[PDB]
Design a protein around this ligand. Sequence first.
Ligand SMILES: [K+]
Ligand SMILES: [K+]
Ligand SMILES: [K+]
Ligand SMILES: [Mn+2]
Ligand SMILES: [Mn+2]
Ligand SMILES: [Mn+2]
Ligand code: NA
Ligand code: NA
Ligand code: NA
Ligand code: NA
Ligand code: NA
Lengths: 521, 512, 519
Amino acid sequence: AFIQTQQLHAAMADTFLEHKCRLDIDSAPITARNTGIICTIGPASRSVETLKEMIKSGMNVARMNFSHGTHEYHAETIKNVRTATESFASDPILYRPVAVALDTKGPEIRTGLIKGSGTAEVELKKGATLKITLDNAYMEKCDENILWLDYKNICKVVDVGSKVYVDDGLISLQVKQKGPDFLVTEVENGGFLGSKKGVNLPGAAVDLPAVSEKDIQDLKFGVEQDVDMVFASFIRKAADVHEVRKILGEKGKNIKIISKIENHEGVRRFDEILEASDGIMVARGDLGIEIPAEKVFLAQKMIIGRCNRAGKPVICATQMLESMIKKPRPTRAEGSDVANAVLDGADCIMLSGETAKGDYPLEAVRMQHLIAREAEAAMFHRKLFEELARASSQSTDLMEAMAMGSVEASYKCLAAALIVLTESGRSAHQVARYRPRAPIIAVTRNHQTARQAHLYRGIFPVVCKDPVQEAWAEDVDLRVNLAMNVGKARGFFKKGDVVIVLTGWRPGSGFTNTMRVVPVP
Amino acid sequence: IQTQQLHAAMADTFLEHKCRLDIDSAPITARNTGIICTIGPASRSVETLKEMIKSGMNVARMNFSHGTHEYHAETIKNVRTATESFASDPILYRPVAVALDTKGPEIRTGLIAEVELKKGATLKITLDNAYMEKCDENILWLDYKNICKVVDVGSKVYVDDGLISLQVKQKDFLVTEVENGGFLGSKKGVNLPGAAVDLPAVSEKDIQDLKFGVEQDVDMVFASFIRKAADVHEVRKILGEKGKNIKIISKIENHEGVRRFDEILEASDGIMVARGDLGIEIPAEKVFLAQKMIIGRCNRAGKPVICATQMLESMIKKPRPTRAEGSDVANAVLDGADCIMLSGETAKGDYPLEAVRMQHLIAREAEAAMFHRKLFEELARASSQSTDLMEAMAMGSVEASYKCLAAALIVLTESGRSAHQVARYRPRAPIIAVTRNHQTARQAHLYRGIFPVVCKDPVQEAWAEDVDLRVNLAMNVGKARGFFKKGDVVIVLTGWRPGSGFTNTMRVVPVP
Amino acid sequence: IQTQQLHAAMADTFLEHKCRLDIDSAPITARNTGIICTIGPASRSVETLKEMIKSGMNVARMNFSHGTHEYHAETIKNVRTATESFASDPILYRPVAVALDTKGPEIRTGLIKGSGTAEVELKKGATLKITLDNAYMEKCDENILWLDYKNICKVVDVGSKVYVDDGLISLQVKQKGPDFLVTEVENGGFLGSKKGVNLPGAAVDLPAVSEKDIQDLKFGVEQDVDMVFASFIRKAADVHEVRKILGEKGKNIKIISKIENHEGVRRFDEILEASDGIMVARGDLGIEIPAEKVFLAQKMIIGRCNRAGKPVICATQMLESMIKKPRPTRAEGSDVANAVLDGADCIMLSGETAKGDYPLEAVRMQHLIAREAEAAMFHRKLFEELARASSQSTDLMEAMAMGSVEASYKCLAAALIVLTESGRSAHQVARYRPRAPIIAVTRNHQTARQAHLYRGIFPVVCKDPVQEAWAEDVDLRVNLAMNVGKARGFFKKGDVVIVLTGWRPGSGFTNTMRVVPVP
Ligand SMILES: [K+]
Ligand SMILES: [K+]
Ligand SMILES: [K+]
Ligand SMILES: [Mn+2]
Ligand SMILES: [Mn+2]
Ligand SMILES: [Mn+2]
Ligand code: NA
Ligand code: NA
Ligand code: NA
Ligand code: NA
Ligand code: NA
């Protein structure tokens, strides 16, 4: 017979078990890819020529990691991202908006530099003694006997018996003795130690500021450089989010704050954090050191579920395709991890070392793109929609009603897209929350709306640069036709397919109160 | 306390839904289930018919088992006189449909005056025309000439609504023994359950009657004793080209009609569960199975289904119904019947207006008590093979109406089709269907929730203006009828352009 | 064609289930819904009662709104004579329960005067004076109506509605006198003698349990009745009053609260908690509240009783036309079927058996409709939903019941055999709604009679002495159930049944479940 595209046979299952049993490797996914791809920029991906290829390969958001680098460095990276992005601007039908994200240092603890003498890294051997010092005379003279770190109040928050993790939690030490300003430890889990490695104190109430003087400088720079969003590190409570918001101030009021959940306190206080934030990142690197690694999937699924329920963006991050730093193909676990994040409901997925420093940045981007489309088709939309509807049923909001009606109609007629005209993005955000399988082409004259729309599953932002037409009906038609041309050019649909179109009836309509089923011309 | 059983609406399971049903949760003003009333001596006057309309009658049923063409022509005239007496007010005028219910392949006795048949007593059944008007305790004439070729020894014969039963002892005559006795009058109905009755689907009389229906511009035919698709097509062929727009509603009232239901449904415009004859032809204890199966399959198909017969039977003589009758009406609405019907209760009873009024009250209560969220999900699942664009518009619109608790869906339609597709997905809110087609308006009563409104205004030159005119009319109707007030929200379905072939445009609109 | 609506049973959705219902899918022999019959002039002879038992009657209801203790004692005697006429064969013997239905706080009119017509016509718009003067208690007419509620004027106001004769006549209070009410007829009709009066707007202050009710309840204790149907229960305290009157001697008599007024519906949860079971008393309920709302109360009450695992009875006018006709109306067929689908443990007959021309036909029709509707239940969904509702409980017998019912669905078992003395284990199985009959073998005769309150429990009395070896005593009782099932045509050799027993004499419940072939 005919093998339906986009796992549509599985779509019709009555139970989740039957849905899984019907998944078919010979069911081709659609062309559109709904899951946003966020790429960390670094030495491997920094050039204008590489960035153009990154955009072509699927990058939607460029992440600048302020744990390292000067303002000069980051300004140059941002410049290059914008040069690459605008190189495509001559064709408004094919131009893709690209967002810029600033990821804060936050309250990090780091070691110093390994001493010049001897091997490049020192071996910390199981059972050996290691003294932790705060004496700056050692800040560039760390070795197998004495380790300097930059957290001055460390002795006030740890106890005898405390565990100290170093280098992505790979080395572990146990505190044996406390001095006034030093710690005598025993190496519990040994390994080779390099310079400026991350330190975690999972047992401790670390008392560094949520927003340091450095972070304030960095956030202010972000406002000056017109970044679209901030990924705020180590958010523990709503008050931390409010602090970031206050620093961004009036000038930065439209910059979106994505709180990174990466410690136990952030998980415990998740609901209040979500309420205060514009979205969330599941920051799995630190999270899986701060809590037992075998528990991370619980936090990931809980956080993604709760964000989906709230209609707020959620990003899955860290080690998704880690082996691709050195290899041109991912492991089977990595393929599975990306697919399952998409199935979980992540709006965006992220690359870190894979794009920042790795040997195969373009291949990493391309692989996220391929896996995302497969997993998107494999979602159980009918059930997901019912469950989202149930969760939000206390709300009688009119835009939610239009969004739900439009998504339902899109399922029924297998629409090739939903076209949404929006200035603030809000109407498109509501459609995205209800998880259509078809792409959402959001036409906007607001350039920042376009860049920020990448935070939401399925929104394909399109910037309209045409002046406003005097007649509302003509201005609406102009923008709808732009989406039709974009969709055709991108291969999302062709003449004779059907799309759902959401518009405002009048210029003063406060949301898209008008839904049409329209054939593609 | 939330109105309209909205607390129960939010339940996760069917059991929790039932547990939340609340006698103190008031229904809405709108009543979605169509009410079909049989017209007879108790209800035939223009004066009574006006009160019938005011009380909620949507369809007037003329039963052609009895009465001359002259008689029925006069009844039809009176229905139209009563209906048109309200025509000058476009905001309150209610269209009223006219339905012709055929005699069909009935078996009937002759003329007796009454006769007592007692248990054990012998009764001879004859076909000799010399006894047509000479029926008594010993000799009964009936009009089915082939009865002997079709019954066997031991076969049961039911007379007078299945109340009298006879068992054939020997076989142009039949000698029988009276089992269930009783007083027998003239020209009573006869049933032969489990016999293959070979009377024509459409008799010479039925042909005359159907041609009369075309002449009289009836809206629909209720075709008696439909056994198969071919029977429906025989009716359709008589109605012919001139009658092509008359809706054919097949009556399921025998075993074969139930067995061959799917082909009958395909061939028909809608269905009636004709429970009177059905409950004689099959064991009475099985009728609810047939009722639920038929209503479910009609709902699945989006074709009108009517529940009929003895729904409020005791109201022929009493001003209040029994508890079983209240339950029956509620449960038919819960099952999903588009329309419910009255027969003797309105045709000959002492309390016709009270019967109509009671159907109205029960329907509103039961409509609120449906489990719309689950019903919609299940209807969507059943029709998922279809990608129809109007179905998509309908489902999106109904979904939106649930989400924002819209007070109505307004649908602009000429053929009715867009409104029919909204009705099939079972919104809780009323569907105000504005049409310039008067026959569309009358026929719309076959569908749950459609409140038809005739627009008599000239067509405006500008499409947007003509659309607004019709939407405004619906707003005025809804306000006047107490369905909504300024500030409420409604879902509005229109065509984007005059050329659009369905309502491809949906809006959420505040009531002005 | 699959029997027992088993094709419909496999549906994924409620709509699909309905679409699959098949008139050619034969029900099983067993009938699970209990049948309660009101005994009266048409049904109180020993010979008729034997036929009523044969036709399916499980509980004989004595209506104490009428009749003397002498009368009811004679009826009870006859019920027992008929019941025990079958006792010589323990394989076929059917236990029959006796229920006492109280008068409660009724209001009734007096006798129509001797002169003039038998009934008087109360015409719309006409005046009618209500009096409490006993000089008129047997002299009621179209001008003056006596009634027996001495405090009526205290609870009614000008404008109040007064309903008479099953709510068929209505009056509006126009003037209040010290001991009288001037009314205007609103809904007219013909008025006979000793007709029921309802005051839906009023806080009627008659005692829940009158001096007469106390005498009647004590009489019920002395006569060893199995259950009491307590009229007009408005609150938990009313139930406690009845319980106190029954006292220590009557502590094992089951109290079924009749819900028949607005307050009873409002205070339903506390009433259910205090009661052993519930009756939806639809006659009075549909006068006290708008008749069009009764189905809401019925479905809510049945649902909540099902969730609690407490017996619920649907009552009143189920087959009303059969008082005079040998066949019911289509609405009546529908009503019975829908009560069973709703989840009623028992269904009831009133005038149909007490005074009608066709009492046996009425019982037989309830039997036929019940079996058809039982098969048409959506058991898979019902079980899921009941399990969901009770999931806060981790009770061990509930776990055995759910496991046993689940197993019964999976292997299409022909019965669940349950060995029980108190009935508790069988009651928990019934609560989870298997499609197969529950054959409950008990040595406690009162347990057997009371088991009729629960859907699907087919009680069987074991009269054999206790065997010394527990395993042999268990086998003896299982074998009795096997013999009963075979004799009744529930199953034959080679079919499969689920058997629930205690592992040892001291097990407090049936902690042992087996899948067993019928020998
Ligand atoms: K960082
Ligand atoms: K007819
Ligand atoms: K009583
Ligand atoms: Mn981190
Ligand atoms: Mn018929
Ligand atoms: Mn009562
Ligand atoms: Na070194
Ligand atoms: Na918007
Ligand atoms: Na249309
Ligand atoms: Na008299
Ligand atoms: Na027990």
